[PDB]
């Protein structure tokens, strides 16, 4: 549980927002890319795994699951790649809700930044800090408890 | 102490590596940029602060300290900007050693990636995971203890 993350890809302003959600806490990391490719997903995972102890990743679609570059990055970083098939079906709805919510925050900050990428990072900040505990507090507690 | 970070800028392959070090743990985040501008530093800080509870940043030089964009980002994210003047003089030597160490790791992984940015992220991973606790474990413990 402490090492489980879910990939999520959403669209805005003709661009792609790639999101990694720490399932147990709701904590996110996100980036803007021109389009989802195996290479971009692989690089994103390498960054993520150097920052948090990523054990398992539920990939967001079959193309990324299949991608030889994504597979290489998961091998390199010691990540077990799994499908993102929501056998538990509330999972989809939770991600759907998060995308809607992230887009709402992006709209609220949008005019404070020229570039979408900046607005996305502001939205990540607001999401992770919103409180009772915040997502940022929850992920730290979960992992700290796991270490010990 | 749990919220104190230090900026560090180093050069390799004609490019700039921007590093943020969590002083109490030795944990790092890093990115490759073409050159160190206020805008790049500001964006880097926005990303950092959405991911970890950044209270104080010791900026790496006077241009970034002065930068109106860096100041804007610190205001937005609730970061106290301080100078990076090592009144305590072992500080500079610790950063020097870290840059040398990071460059060593980059050399060790360099041939496994086409692009410098990828090698830097591999180096971040190795640095943060190296154990007795790792930097990644230490930062989580420090912040978890602080929350309580
Ligand atoms: C996971 C590692 C082991 C391999 C991948 C794929 N690279 C190769 O197969 C390769 C190895 C050696 N020489 C050339 C290519 C690295 C990678 C992933 C994602 C990226 C990248 C890179 C990159 O190569 O910089 O660039 C931006 O997005
Ligand atoms: C910290 C926030 C409040 C302000 C900065 C500076 N921007 C403005 O002053 C501005 C505000 C409104 N319309 C246009 C410009 C945002 C920022 C920081 C770093 C970056 C950026 C941006 C960006 O504007 O996207 O782009 C890549 O590196
Ligand atoms: Cl880690
Ligand atoms: Cl946070």
- Structural domain including A118 reads 1-148
Helix (H) or strand (E) holding B65: helix B62-66
Within 8 A by CB and 6+ apart from A91, the residues are A6
Residue by residue, DSSP assigns B5-45 as EEEEEEEETTEEEEEEEETTTTEEEEEEESS--HHHHHHHH
- Structural domain total, chain B: 1
Centre a 10 Å sphere on the Cβ of residue A62 and count the other Cβ atoms it contains. 11
**How far is B34 from B11, CA to CA, in rounded Å?**
10
* 3-state SS, residue A132: coil
CA angle A94, A126, B32 (to 5 degrees): 100
Residue A141, chain B, CB below 8 Å: the answer is yes
Cα dihedral sign for A38, B102, B55, B23?
Answer: positive
Residue by residue, DSSP assigns B79-101 as PEEE----SSTHHHHHHHHHHHH
CA dihedral B48→A13→B39→B140, nearest 10 degrees, is 0
**How far is A34 from A96, CA to CA, in rounded Å?**
21
Backbone angles phi, psi at B48, to 5 degrees: -60, -45
Residue of B nearest to A127 (CA): B50
If you compute the radius of gyration of chain B from its CA atoms, what whole number of angstroms results?
15
Q: Which of A20, A43, A47, A113 to mutate to test the interface with B (most CBs of B within 10 A)?
A: A47
Resolution, expressed in angstroms to one decimal: 1.8
**How far is A59 from A72, CA to CA, in rounded Å?**
14
**How far is A138 from A120, CA to CA, in rounded Å?**
21
Q: How far apart are the first and last CA of chain B?
A: 15
CATH number of B72's domain? 3.30.420.10
* 3-state SS, residue A122: helix
Residue B141, chain A, CB below 8 Å: the answer is yes
Q: How were these coordinates obtained?
A: X-ray
């Amino acid at each position: 549980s402490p090492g489980i993350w879910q990939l999520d890809c959403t669209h805005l302003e003709g661009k792609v927002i790639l999101v990694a959600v720490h399932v147990a806490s709701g904590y996110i990391e996100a980036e803007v890319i021109p389009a989802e490719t195996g290479q971009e997903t692989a690089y994103f995972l390498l960054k993520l795994a150097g920052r948090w102890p990523v054990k398992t990743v539920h990939t967001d679609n079959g193309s990324n699951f299949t991608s030889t570059t994504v597979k290489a990055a998961c091998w390199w970083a010691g990540i077990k790649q799994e499908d993102g098939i929501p056998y538990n079906p509330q999972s989809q709805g939770v991600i759907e809700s998060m995308n809607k919510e992230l887009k709402k925050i992006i709209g609220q900050v949008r005019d404070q930044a020229e570039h979408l990428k900046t607005a996305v990072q502001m939205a990540v900040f607001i999401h992770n800090h919103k409180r009772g505990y915040s997502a940022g507090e929850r992920i730290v507690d979960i992992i700290a408890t796991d270490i010990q």
